[PDB]
Every structure is written in structure tokens, then in C-alpha cells.
Amino acid sequence: MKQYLELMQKVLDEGTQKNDRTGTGTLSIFGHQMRFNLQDGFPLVTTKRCHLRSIIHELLWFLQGDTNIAYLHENNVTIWDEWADENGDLGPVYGKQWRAWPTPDGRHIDQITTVLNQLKNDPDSRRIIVSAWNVGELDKMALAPCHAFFQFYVADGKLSCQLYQRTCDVFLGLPFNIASYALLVHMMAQQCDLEVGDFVWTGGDTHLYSNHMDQTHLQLSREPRPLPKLIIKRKPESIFDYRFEDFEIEGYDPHPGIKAPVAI
Amino acid sequence: MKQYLELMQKVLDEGTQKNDRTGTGTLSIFGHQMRFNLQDGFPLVTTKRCHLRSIIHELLWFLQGDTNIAYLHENNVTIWDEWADENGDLGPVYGKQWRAWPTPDGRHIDQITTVLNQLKNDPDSRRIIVSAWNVGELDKMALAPCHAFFQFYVADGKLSCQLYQRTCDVFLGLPFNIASYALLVHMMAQQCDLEVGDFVWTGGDTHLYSNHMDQTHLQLSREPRPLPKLIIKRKPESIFDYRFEDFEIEGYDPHPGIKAPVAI
């Protein structure tokens, strides 16, 4: 997508050479932001073939609040396998914080429900936020939240959402992230009888791994194509009652897929 | 400052008319980002006369972790008076979360110390973060955090920091925020023997109050002037040992001050 490709080029032109968790080197920049008007089409990268299957399952899984990969496994979604322990547990990751952020006084805060309550009763609120960054729970998580905090906004009948992604693998991870949140906005908007607005993506440490440079140049030589259209076949009674089959993508005509090799 | 003025103009040109906590109306946009290369000068607005006195005291106060306004009062800093209760308490605001985020297992997480430990031992870490957004503590705070989360980054010997400000009063509040964090970056950099890099400011609900429109037009007619220079007269043994007198501003030549009327 135009915005996605411009970021790739920016990292290439302005990124600084360093490293990561001490594995593969990277080219990185700090601080970036782009906007996707969801009215112009669902932001699924077209310069390389992407799929939404795993993304959809993962989102529904997040919304359910259970952090055990069973549901994901039952459905052949393996992106979390790498981090899961023998029992398939990942600790208090995303889902747990979204639906049951633990407090010292013994409560489990349902941030998703809170947000919907706000979008319904006080849409102009300036703190319609969901945070996965639970400082006292980080150590117990298999992985610290990458997409750690997001905020909603309503204006002229449209629902917008900004995401703060503290760390971002532009080539491999980012395509996943944009689609995931774009999907959430569509779902929330539907539940709130609102049109979809903008998805504002903000990143912190935004980088490209050195072993993805050829892949990036290849992708940059491809012209983006019209964005596909998301179709929601059903209107569930709540944000927690969506099913995989409710989503469909129309008009997705992407360039060939590009593999993402990763060191271990 | 160029970046600050461009934001004002953007809100004017693209902002949508609505309201706030149901008081004064506003013109607002959602999602914005700007960068200040601290090597080009300390980002203290020059198109209107600003002062750093309150800002400095408040920052040192935050760093100390005590959320009672006594210290601020002792020094004639009154910006928190409005929210303080009879005992001068504000609840678990910024300071408390920065230095002692409470966990359900009974610990108080020192995020500032954690960050310094990271900048010292693992500067390439992608999670050098401090968050004030403690979901289970919001209700107890006199005010939910506006500048709620920030992340540091190190590259080529320079320390950068990005701030996520969920809500922003462009005219009245923003000047304060930029200077405050710019100051923190300078202090952290000094403690870490690093040069100052960029301060990346990211906002969520970014607005101008309708009763600040004339003020905004006035300010927009003024040409920004060279940014002043921050001087740190002393090199403390830790981030917690700074004193008000350690900071000085050189070359600050601003246009006349502009009052910010506020409804109640």
C-alpha cells in the first residue's frame, strides 16, 4: 500500500544500522505515523500476497480473553506456538489485559466492554483507550506487547482508532498489525452503528531486518493495487459474538507472496 | 515553533467542530506527530512568551514520586491546585506510576530506574518504556494521565524519546508538554553520557478550544524565532538528584505572552 511502501523506503533511506534482541542486524528509525482512511478500502497489503485467516482467529481469540492457544490450535493457527509453553499457556498477554486487566484490589477490568460503553454513552470522550501494557504483568507474559496501546475517536459518524506499536518488524509483522486493527475498527463501528473512519498507526522502534533487504527491494518495485473490500455477512449482538465465517474480502488482487526468512 | 504552528494551522484547516467534557466547544483532529531535533535548540515556544519555572518543579516532583502537592506549593507552583483535595492529595497520578506502579503481588515498580538500567545495560532494547496509564488506578487519580506513555531509543550516541499524549489542548497545554519531556530527555541523556536526539510527540485527540481561536490566529501571525539553549550547570549523581537551579535557558527571545481564558 502507498503508506506502507513509503515507510519501507524511509527505513531504507533514513534507518540506522544496529541490531535487535542480539540476533539479526537491522536498519531502524524511531517514531513514525501513517493514516489509512478505511472508507478507501480494507488495508491489506497488495504488493505481496497476504491472508487474513490467522489474523481473524487471533482477533476473536483476543476478544475472548483466554490466553491459552487451544482455540488457535483447534483452528490450525500457529503464529503463537513459538511462544507457548508445554501447557499451551502464554501468560497474561493481550487477551488477558483487554478483557480482565488485574488490579491489586482483586478486580478484572474489561477494557473492551468499557470502550463500547463509552462509544455508546460518551463518544466524545478523550480516554476511550485499551492498553496491553500492564507493567506488573510483563515478566509473566511470554512476550511483551508489541501493539501495546490503542485509542478510539468519533467524529461525523465515523469511528477512528490509533495504535501505538512500540516495536515493529516492517516487512514481516506490520502487514499483520494493520489488518488486525483495521478489522477491529470495522467490528466496533458495526456494533456502534457508526461508519469506519481512519486507522492511525504509530510506531516506536520501526525496523527492517538485514536479511529482508532483498525482499524489501523486490516489494518496492511492485505497484500497489486497489485495496480490497471487507464484508461482514452478519450483525452479531455484541463484540464478543463474531465468528470466523462472518468476514469476507472482496476484490483482493495481490502480487505474489514473498517469504520472510528468520534467524533463530 | 515551526512544527507547533503547523499543528495549529492543521487543527484550524482540518479540525472538526464538536465539544469536550461538555463545557467549551472545540475544533479537533485525531492522530498527529511531529519531531523536534533537540540538537537544534530547546523546544520552548517563541511565538508567545512561555516560562519553565513550573515545568521544572513539576518534573522534579514527578521524578520524586510523591503525588501530594506540598513540594509544589512550597515553591509557588499552582498548576495542580485545581485538582488537589483538601489534604493536597491528587491520588496515584504520574509520579506514583513512574516510581511505584503498584502490582497485585504487592510491589511498587520503579519505571524510571528500570529505564536507566536499560539505557545503561541494553540501550538497543525496544521496550524502554514508562507508562502512567495504570488502568486499575485511573478512578483514584484526580485526573487521568494526558501524557500517558513514553518510550526511549538510542542510536549514534543520541537519546530520543516519543510521547503519546491521548488528549491535547494545543494552545494552552501543548507548549508545557513539549518543554517538560524535552527537559527529561536532556536529563536522562546527561545521566547516560549520551547526546540529545529527537523528541517525537504523538497526540490522540488534538484540539483547540473555540474561545482560543483569536489567540491562535494572533500567534499564527508571528514568525518563530531561534530556539533557546538549555544549560545544565551541574552533573548530579543520579536522575533523582537534580535541583531547580541546575537548569538555565539561554537565548530565549519570545514574542509577547498571550493569555489563555478558560471556562469553568
UniProtKB/Swiss-Prot annotation, chains A, B:
One Gene Ontology molecular-function label: protein homodimerization activity
Known function: Catalyzes the reductive methylation of 2'-deoxyuridine-5'-monophosphate (dUMP) to 2'-deoxythymidine-5'-monophosphate (dTMP) while utilizing 5,10-methylenetetrahydrofolate (mTHF) as the methyl donor and reductant in the reaction, yielding dihydrofolate (DHF) as a by-product. This enzymatic reaction provides an intracellular de novo source of dTMP, an essential precursor for DNA biosynthesis. This protein also binds to its mRNA thus repressing its own translation.
Keyword RNA-binding: yes
Enzyme Commission identifier(s): 2.1.1.45
Assembly and oligomerization: Homodimer.
GO terms for cellular component: cytosol
Superkingdom of origin organism: Bacteria
Compartments, record wording: Cytoplasm
GO terms (BP aspect): dTMP biosynthetic process; dTTP biosynthetic process; methylation; regulation of translation; response to radiation
Effect on the protein of changing N177A: Shows 200-fold decrease in catalytic activity, 20-fold decrease in affinity for dUMP, and 10-fold decrease in affinity for mTHF
Ligand binding (dUMP): R21, R126, R127, R166, T167, C168, D169, N177, H207, L208, Y209
Active site: C146
Similarity annotation: Belongs to the thymidylate synthase family. Bacterial-type ThyA subfamily.
Binding site for (6R)-5,10-methylene-5,6,7,8-tetrahydrofolate: H51, D169, A263
Post-translational modification summary for this protein: Although not discussed in the published references, Met-1 is represented in the submitted PDB entries as being modified by either a formyl, or a carboxyl group. The N-terminal is probably N-(dihydroxymethyl)methionine, the hydrated form of N-formylmethionine.
Record carries keyword Repressor: yes
Record's protein name: Thymidylate synthase
Pathway where this protein functions: Pyrimidine metabolism; dTTP biosynthesis
Keywords: Cytoplasm, Formylation, Methyltransferase, Nucleotide biosynthesis, Repressor, RNA-binding, Transferase, Translation regulation
The gene coding this protein: thyA
